[PDB]
Amino acid sequence: FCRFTAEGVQEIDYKDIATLKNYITESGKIVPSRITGTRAKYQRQLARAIKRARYLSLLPYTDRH
Amino acid sequence: SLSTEATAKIVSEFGRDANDTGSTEVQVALLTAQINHLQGHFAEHKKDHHSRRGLLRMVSQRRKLLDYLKRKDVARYTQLIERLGLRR
Amino acid sequence: PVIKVRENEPFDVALRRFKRSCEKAGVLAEVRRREFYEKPTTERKRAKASAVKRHAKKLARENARRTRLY
Amino acid sequence: AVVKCKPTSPGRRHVVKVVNPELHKGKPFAPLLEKNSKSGGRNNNGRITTRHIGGGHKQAYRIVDFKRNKDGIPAVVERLEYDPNRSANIALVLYKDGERRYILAPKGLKAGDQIQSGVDAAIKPGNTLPMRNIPVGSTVHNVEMKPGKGGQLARSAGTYVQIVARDGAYVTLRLRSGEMRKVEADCRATLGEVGNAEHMLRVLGKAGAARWRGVRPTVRGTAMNPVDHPHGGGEGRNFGKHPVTPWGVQTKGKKTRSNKRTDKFIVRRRS
Amino acid sequence: MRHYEIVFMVHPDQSEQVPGMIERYTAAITGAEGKIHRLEDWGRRQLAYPINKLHKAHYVLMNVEAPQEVIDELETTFRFNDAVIRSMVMRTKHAVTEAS
Amino acid sequence: SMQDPIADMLTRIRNGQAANKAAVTMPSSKLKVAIANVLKEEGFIEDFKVEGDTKPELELTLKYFQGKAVVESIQRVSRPGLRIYKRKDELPKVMAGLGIAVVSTSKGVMTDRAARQAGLGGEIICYVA
RNA sequence: CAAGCUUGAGUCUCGUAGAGGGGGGUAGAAUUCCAGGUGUAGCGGUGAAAUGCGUAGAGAUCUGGAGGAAUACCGGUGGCGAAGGCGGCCCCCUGGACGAAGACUGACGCUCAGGUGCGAAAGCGUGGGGAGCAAACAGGAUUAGAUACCCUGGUAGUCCACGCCGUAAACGAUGUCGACUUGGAGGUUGUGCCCUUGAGGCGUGGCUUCCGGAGCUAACGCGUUAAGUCGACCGCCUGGGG
Ligand SMILES: [Mg+2]
Ligand SMILES: [Mg+2]
Ligand SMILES: [Mg+2]
Ligand SMILES: [Mg+2]
Ligand SMILES: [Mg+2]
Ligand SMILES: [Mg+2]
Ligand SMILES: [Mg+2]
Ligand SMILES: [Mg+2]
Ligand SMILES: [Mg+2]
Ligand SMILES: [Mg+2]
Ligand SMILES: [Mg+2]
Ligand SMILES: [Mg+2]
Ligand SMILES: [Mg+2]
Ligand SMILES: [Mg+2]
Ligand SMILES: [Mg+2]
Ligand SMILES: [Mg+2]
Ligand SMILES: [Mg+2]
Ligand SMILES: [Mg+2]
């Protein structure tokens, strides 16, 4: 199934970057939920964390710096 | 936001019981305490036309509770407005 | 869309890999949609029809997947 | 606050008063007052050098401290007073040691605040410290041009100076005019922005309202005879000539700066 | 009495003074009657994009419980501290310890 | 909110018959039971029940003859917005007496035929045909 | 009128989801400009072209800097708000909604003429700011003309603070509040049981999308979020122009 974050019922943090790197493309764009399969409740948490990881320079804004 | 400590003090003050939350005096007292709290907010953020609309629901609701109390029991009305301070 | 050409291989396959990157990353399409400014109404209207006709295709499929034709 | 007067008289319709209730309503501080005599625009030769000056109301000079050469020793604001010689209100300041002084009043300074000067000072409005310690990109008034000179930039009501960059021993400043300058990094700079920013929104309203500020009437060149002004002449409102100053030099476009010794410090000219 | 998740980076040339700077920030909060729950010093890491320069950095994690006034004052100390770049402040989920 | 409970009782019955249901329920009152105690012996409705102790729920058992229903049409006349009282001499007649009209005389709730036979007039509650 | 009652209405406890509002900061991408380094003769634009920029060395490319505005991907017939409307991240002030289990007041209710408050965009006033777009305007084209569509430029304006303005196809062209009346396929947000067998299965709550039954009606169509069967108030309509 697409049960990845729905199994781990929690909040998604920005300091676990290995989990976050699964849900971004090669260029750094957030992957739409039509592909990953995560439900809408955790998509927003997953999206917000990435926007926090980018600020702390843990993830790249684009693939050209 | 009327933190639980402030709420729990007023109910025990005005209420007949320690669990008599919901009487007109304790409802009007809780509405009064929050309105006086919101004066310091709207005295600086004058362009909060959204939060002000929620304060006018508290002002009107308190007004309805006073009229019902006055029509029912005048003696209980005259003490409550005196303890709180309003109607002018 | 950075590509690193591997040990030799053919330049055509390296080119075909670079083209796939632009197709998959939407580099071509975003430039066209942002070349001119259309009003916010047109953006809301176009998404309305796009979703309505997408769902209408699904609702019109059930009227032909069981009805004999010839 | 600005208030519009009521049109009870023809000469009171168009009056806007800038009134601050916080100003001290009594007499100034006695030891910080000197005599100040008017001149009327006459130099030692007795001839009027600058025109349209004369009369007014008698004023007494107030010794406003510009250097602020007191490291440490924090001071408190006693009151804010009206200074006739300036556009900005002044502030009487009492130091913990005991001395009293007059300083310029920043916008965010009330009666009771604590300020000080020196490198050790903290970054708050009204405090003074050399540029090397002020963060780049800050708003600053009472800038010095030479270390120890005293302070000449951003002294009027509501003005300020931006610190754009820092290069070696020099600091680049964006001035209120629009100019960019390079002043030494060791010039002191009071931190903040000058107060009394309502000074603009003040219409005098009548002819005599400017006569008691010391401004005499201004006769236009076209209204004179040909001997008295290059415009002059005419039989029924003729001009026919390029505008000029009353001494022949051309106004309305012609530049006049010529220094050649301070052109090193001008990054870019006025916008 | 709020919870926070301060995370800031010191730029690597002054990374030798981080322990002598950590103690000062927790000195005020403890001195202002506030608790500290984590001190995860991530060490010298590498940015995903240069901060105008300076491809490396030195990361710190705090997770401090303190009154809001101290944190308001602690925020401006990071602003004027030259060695500190891109301070961050967060909120509740009170007690945490993970993700070194 | 609701300002007339009587038209509620009629509407529950009218909707029930049209929807072809067996029995309807509603909060009960002495006026609702009295009207039910009229339709029942006029043949329009079978037995009713007033079960309940603090929240009484008047239940009516509807009636049918064929694929169609019994109650042809039942409408409220003296609505709270406009109340109607009629004298004995000019009590109405529903379908030339084919149907019944419920009136509330000073002696109780009775059909218009039973009020003329008693010499009375009262508020006209409804026309049941 | 008096005394009750609990269903309507409301308060308290716990919790959840949100571009709901005000204020203050900080990022990264991109456009424009400025100062320089390489370097050549084209660049730009169109249906075609010309105006325009360029050997005074442009366009292209690299380094540094200054400014203003808006927030790619997430993004969704998704969410919130009375309506207008609301979209980077963080902070501190604040409103509303919903759900589980109970206590509490006990008709405290619905609608509302005159009033009062909010109210897109353009527009007005006084200060700022001005990158990009761009009414007006100028030139180049097409044209029989072209005060237009097309091209190269370009000021008010769009941005901020405080005041006016008070109108829109301000539109689900559908007033608010209650009651009842067969069904399906979904979206979003709570919850209490088993099979915490791990996915799951059983139901109950709140908003919301599409299709359709009776019924409604001029027909289109609406159809439990009615335009169906009904109650309580309010606003409006009475042939087309003028
Ligand atoms: Mg409340
Ligand atoms: Mg003049
Ligand atoms: Mg003459
Ligand atoms: Mg002459
Ligand atoms: Mg003449
Ligand atoms: Mg002439
Ligand atoms: Mg009205
Ligand atoms: Mg506007
Ligand atoms: Mg304007
Ligand atoms: Mg202007
Ligand atoms: Mg144009
Ligand atoms: Mg209208
Ligand atoms: Mg009109
Ligand atoms: Mg609209
Ligand atoms: Mg619409
Ligand atoms: Mg309309
Ligand atoms: Mg209303
Ligand atoms: Mg339908």
DSSP state of E13: G
Using the mean position of ligand 3's atoms as its centre, give its distance from the Cα of residue D223 in Å.
6
Taking the alpha carbons at both ends of chain C, their separation in whole angstroms is 50
Q: Please indicate, yes or no, whether residues D39 and D73 belong to a single structural domain of this protein.
A: yes
E61 falls within a domain:
yes
Please say whether the beta carbons of F126 and F75 come within 8 A.
yes
Q: Is residue E9 part of a domain?
A: yes
Q: If DSSP codes are grouped into helix, strand and coil, which group holds residue C41?
A: helix
Distance in angstroms between the alpha carbons of the first and the last residue of chain A: 37
The coordinates were experimentally obtained by cryo-EM
Task: Check if the beta carbon of residue B28 is closer than 8 Å to that of residue B36.
Answer: no
For residue A58, the chain E residues in CB contact (below 8 A) are 48
Chain centre distance of CA E91: 14
Q: Is E3 buried (19+), middle (13-18) or exposed (0-12) by CB count in 10 A?
A: middle
Interface residues of chain A, partner chain C, Cβ below 8 Å: 25-27, 29, 63-64
Domain boundary among D159, D194, D229: D194
Look at residues E49, E40, E54, E39 and name the one whose alpha carbon lies nearest to residue E84.
E54
* Residues paired with D100 in a beta bridge: D94
CB contact under 8 A, E88 and A56: yes
DSSP characters over chain B: ---HHHHHHHHHHHSSSSS-TTSHHHHHHHHHHHHHHHHHHHTT-TT-HHHHHHHHHHHHHHHHHHHHHHHH-HHHHHHHHHHHT---
How many Å from the CA of B65 to C1' of G188? 37
- Same structural domain, F78 and F64: no
Q: Is there a contact between D78 and D92 (Cβ–Cβ < 8 Å)?
A: yes
For tokens 């010689």, the residue is: D85
| CA–CA dist A51, E70 (Å, integer) | 27
Note the strand G nucleotides within 7 A of protein beta carbons: 5-8, 10-14, 17-23, 26-29, 65-67, 72-78, 81-84, 88-96, 103-105, 107-110, 117-119, 126-128, 133, 162-163, 177-182, 187-190, 199-200, 210-211, 214, 228-233
CA distance D135 to C6: 50
Q: Say how far apart CA F6 and CA F102 lie, in whole Å.
A: 12
A60: chain E residues, CB-CB within 8 Å? 48-49
Three-class SS string for chain D? Answer: CEEECCCCCCCCCCCEEECCCCCCCCCCCHHHEECCCCCCCECCCCCECCCCCCCCCCCCEECECCCCCCEEEEEEEEEEECCCCCCCCEEEEEECCCCEEEEECECCCCCCCEEEECCCCCCCCCCEEEHHHCCCCCEEEEECCCCCCCCCECCCCCCCEEEEEEECCEEEEECCCCCEEEEECCCEEEECCECCHHHHCCCCCCCHHHHCCCCCCCCCHHHCCCCCCCCCCCCCCCCCCCCECCCCCECCCCCCCCCCCCCCCEEECCC
Provide the token pair at C59.
């609702």
CA distance F9 to F16: 11
With CB atoms and an 8 Å threshold, state whether A57 touches E88: no
Based on the fold, state whether residues D68 and D122 are members of the same structural domain.
no
List of long-range contacts for E69-72, beta carbons under 8 Å, 24+ apart: E69/E32, E70/E28, E70/E29, E70/E32, E70/E34, E71/E2, E71/E4, E71/E6
How far, in Å, are D119, F85, F86 from residue F119 at the CA level?
A: 110, 15, 12
Number of domains in chain E: 1
Instruction: Tell me which residue range forms the domain holding E49.
Output: 1-92
Q: Are F42 and F128 in contact (CB under 8 A)?
A: yes
In the DSSP assignment, the letter for residue E20 is H
Domain that holds residue F78: 72-129
Is the same domain home to D4 and D61? yes
Q: Is the domain of D13 the same as that of D89?
A: yes
State whether D12 and D44 are in the same domain: yes
Q: How far apart are the first and last CA of chain F?
A: 29
Does any domain span residue E73? yes
Please tell me whether residues F2 and F59 are part of one structural domain.
Answer: yes
The CA–C1' separation of E88 and G30, in angstroms, is 26
Contact across the interface for A60 and E49, Cβ inside 8 Å: yes
**Cβ-based neighbours of A52, under 8 Å, separated by 6 or more:** A14
CB contacts, 8 Å: C1 with chain A: 27, 63
* N-to-C CA span, chain D: 32
Spatial distance between the Cα atoms of E10 and E21, rounded to a whole number of angstroms: 10
C-alpha A24/C-alpha A28 separation (Å) is: 5
- Contact (CB, 8 A) for E30 and E65: no
Which of chain E's residues 54-83 bind strand G, using a 7 Å CB cutoff?
68, 72
Total Cβ atoms within 10 A of residue B13: 11
| Encoded tokens for B14 | 């005005």
User: Has residue E41 been placed in a domain?
Assistant: yes
Whole-angstrom distance, CA of residue D39 vs CA of residue D20: 31
How far apart are alpha carbons A20 and A50 in whole angstroms?
A: 7
| Nucleic strand G contact set for B 6-25 (CB, < 7 Å) | 7-8, 11, 17, 19-24
* Domain match, D74 and D177 both: no
Q: Tell whether F41 and F52 lie within a shared domain.
A: yes
Residue E53's closest chain A neighbor by CA? A65
How many structural domains does chain F have?
2
Q: At which of D88, D113, D138 does a domain end? A: D113
Buried b (16+ CB within 10 A) or exposed e, B14-47: bbeeeeebebbbbbbbbbbebeeebeeeeeeeee
* CB-CB neighbors (< 8 A) of A15 in chain E: 61, 98-99
To 10 degrees, what angle do helices E68-80 and E18-31 make? Answer: 150
Instruction: Record the tokens describing residue E50, joined without a space.
Output: 């240069």
Neighbours of D192 (CB within 10 A): 26
Spatial strand order in the sheet of E56-61? E43-46, E56-61, E7-10, E84-85
Residues of the domain holding D64: 1-113
**How close is the nearest chain A Cα to the Cα of C50, in Å?**
17
Residue entry with tokens 């002495």:
F30
Q: Which of residues 79-98 of F touch strand G (CB under 7 A)?
A: 79-82
Residue D235 token pair: 């039989």
Domain holding D58: CATH number?
A: 2.40.50.140
Structure tokens at D130: 């050399």
CB atoms closer than 10 angstroms to residue D162: 16
- Chain C residue with Cα closest to A62: C1
In whole angstroms, give the CA distance from residue D234 to residue D226: 8
According to the CATH classification, is domain B1-88 in 1.10.1370.30? no
D178 nearest nt, CA–C1': G66
Domain identity same for D136 and D219: no
Contact E64, E8 (CB under 8 A): no
For residue E44, give both structure tokens: 């010298």
Question: How do the domains of chain B map onto residue ranges?
Answer: 1-88
Token code pair at residue A16: 């676990």
Identify the helix (H) or strand (E) that includes residue E66: strand E64-66
A vs C: CB pairs below 8 A:
10
Residues 8-67 of C with CB under 7 A from strand G: 30, 37, 47-48, 50-52, 55-56, 59
Do F55 and F80 lie in a common domain?
A: no
- Verify whether the Cβ–Cβ distance A63 to C2 is below 8 Å: yes
